[PDB]
Amino acid sequence: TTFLIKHKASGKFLHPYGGSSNPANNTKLVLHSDIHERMYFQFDVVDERWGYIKHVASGKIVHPYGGQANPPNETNMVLHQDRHDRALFAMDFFNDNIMHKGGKYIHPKGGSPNPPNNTETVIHGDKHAAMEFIFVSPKNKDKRVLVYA
């Protein structure tokens, strides 16, 4: 299933910085209001809840920058071609968050519920309304879709 990753508090979406159809490794992932094919994602299941968040246009996947098993708070989110266990995430569509295998979540940098376009995303352990994400249809940004298959 193809979906948009929507920041629940702002309604902005996860994008590669610059919107490239083939972002370079380590391109940052930001929040931006626009919708287009280069901000479509899919989820590739690896092990029950755990899988890779794949940028459809490039085939690169979401990583914490540096690929640590336990990235510290404020580690930037990026795209990278590599597949390994430090690029594993769970798409928690019940609590509305995205959890890295090490236990921390994807956040807007600085914690704003209404961050401006091109706000970077980072790893952080905290849970609050401004780290919530929902996973929605490219054809209807208010309709949740099932990311697991």
Place this chain on the structure above:
Amino acid sequence: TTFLIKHKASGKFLHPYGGSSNPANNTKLVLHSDIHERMYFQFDVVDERWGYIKHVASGKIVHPYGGQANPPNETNMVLHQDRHDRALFAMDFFNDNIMHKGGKYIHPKGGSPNPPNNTETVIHGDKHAAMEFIFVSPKNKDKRVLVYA
């Protein structure tokens, strides 16, 4: 994906009472320690998180007894052939519970962490450790499997 519905606190599983391959309509669902093909389930997705919990051997699904949209506390869980919105559940594999469309959960009747074999299951709104369920492989009762597949 075929799975066992495992009561987390006790390790017992959801069964039709009597363990038939073809339980009659309105047969109660109970907890029981045995594993066999007549306690296998599948989940048929209807709308994103919402779907039918299907008894594989019979093709009947889990209902609140009487088919309420908002079943009261202590309403019995049963199997029934019918498919409708009052037999929709969500299999919350992050919080480890099974939520009915009306917002309440599947519980062992009385809320014991170690209910005896053949304890009835019911709807109840409370959340606690004795209403948690995990969804496991028929080949490995300790291995969680993805039910949304």
